[PDB]
Amino acid sequence: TRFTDEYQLFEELGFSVVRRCMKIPTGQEYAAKIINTKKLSARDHQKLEREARICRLLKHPNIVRLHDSISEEGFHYLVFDLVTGGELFEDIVAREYYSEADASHCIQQILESVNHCHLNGIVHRDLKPENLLLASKSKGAAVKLADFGLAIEVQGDQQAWFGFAGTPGYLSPEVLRKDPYGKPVDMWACGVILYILLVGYPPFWDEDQHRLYQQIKAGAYDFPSPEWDTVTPEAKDLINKMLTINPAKRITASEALKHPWICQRSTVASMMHRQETVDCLKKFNARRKL
Numbered sequence: 001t002r003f004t005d006e007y008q009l010f011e012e013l014g015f016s017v018v019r020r021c022m023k024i025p026t027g028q029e030y031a032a033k034i035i036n037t038k039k040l041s042a043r044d045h046q047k048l049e050r051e052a053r054i055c056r057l058l059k060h061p062n063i064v065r066l067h068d069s070i071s072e073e074g075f076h077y078l079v080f081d082l083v084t085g086g087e088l089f090e091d092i093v094a095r096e097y098y099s100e101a102d103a104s105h106c107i108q109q110i111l112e113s114v115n116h117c118h119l120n121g122i123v124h125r126d127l128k129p130e131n132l133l134l135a136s137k138s139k140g141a142a143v144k145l146a147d148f149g150l151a152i153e154v155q156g157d158q159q160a161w162f163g164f165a166g167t168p169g170y171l172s173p174e175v176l177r178k179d180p181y182g183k184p185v186d187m188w189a190c191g192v193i194l195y196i197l198l199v200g201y202p203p204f205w206d207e208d209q210h211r212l213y214q215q216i217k218a219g220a221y222d223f224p225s226p227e228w229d230t231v232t233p234e235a236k237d238l239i240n241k242m243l244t245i246n247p248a249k250r251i252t253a254s255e256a257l258k259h260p261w262i263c264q265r266s267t268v269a270s271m272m273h274r275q276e277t278v279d280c281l282k283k284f285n286a287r288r289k290l
């Protein structure tokens with residue numbers, strides 16, 4: 001009965017609902033993921049127990065921070081620290097200066113959170129812009145990876161067909177083939193996001209979802225002129241190593257954190273403003289919210 005007694009519920013933030021709330025004792029504000037637990041199957045009870053366990057384990061500057069896990073009658077509450085910077089992609093389209101260096105800084109933080117997940121045997125499986133939140137500018141504006149409702153626990157490099165999961169534009173070739181998979185599926189999603197961060201449109205796309213899947217399984221993206229002519233070759237190289245259809249050859253999160261475009265940002269990444277990326281990303285964000 002701890003949540004109904006100690007928290008005041010506010011407006012909705014986004015099989016669950018996320019609502020802002022305030023702890024009545026201290027006045028601190030939080031984000032509460034509310035899950036209806038009535039008439040759940042044994043399989044449903046185990047998925048929710050897995051989610052609360054994963055959220056309790058992951059403590060990292062670039063991951064949402066679990067504050068409390070409260071089980072009342074009919075409902076379960078996962079209470080996180082409230083981040084107020086908004087979605088990452090909405091913050092980028094509001095910038096008047098945005099360069100490769102800024103994209104490298106964003107993807108470095110995302111890579112840090114994915115690396116932290118993989119070191120703890122967790123594969124997120126659903127990396128996408130809607131799961132990339134921001135701390136407030138007054139708090140450092142760190143990128144925050146959110147929502148582990150679809151995450152799985154793996155043993156080292158053990159890989160199997162853990163079933164389907166993910167969002168069409170970010171699905172890896174091995175999941176589309178129904179092959180066994182594991183950690184590299186998060187790195188493929190990181191490659192799609194890095195592509196979007198540079199030009200503001202996705203590398204694989206077709207209004208026909210089946211043709212979208214055909215392009216993904218072929219790994220057939222490209223860097224068309226003119227917008228890619230000003231992108232450094234090192235940035236293109238990192239995308240190449242992330243969007244490799246062979247999951248064994250695909251770069252890992254810790255390997256990616258040592259790529260020169262990541263760890264040598266000020267001397268390798270271009271500092272030129274990319275206005276066309278901001279304009280395309282405005283179109284990208286509009287379609288995603290339908």
Ligand SMILES: CCN(CC)[C@@H](C)CNC(=O)c1cc(-c2cnn3ccc(-c4cccs4)nc23)nc(N2CC[C@H]2C(=O)NC)c1
Pocket residue numbers: 013014016017018031033064065080081082083084085086087130131132133146147148
């Ligand atoms: C990412 C989750 N999922 C659903 C489950 C997507 C699809 C929906 N989106 C949300 O539920 C959501 C959560 C938060 C949020 C804010 N702090 N926070 C802390 C923890 C979490 C989560 C932890 C686990 C799942 S969500 N979400 C948030 N902030 C949101 N906003 C929109 C801009 C920003 C904003 O500033 N609006 C005043 C949306």
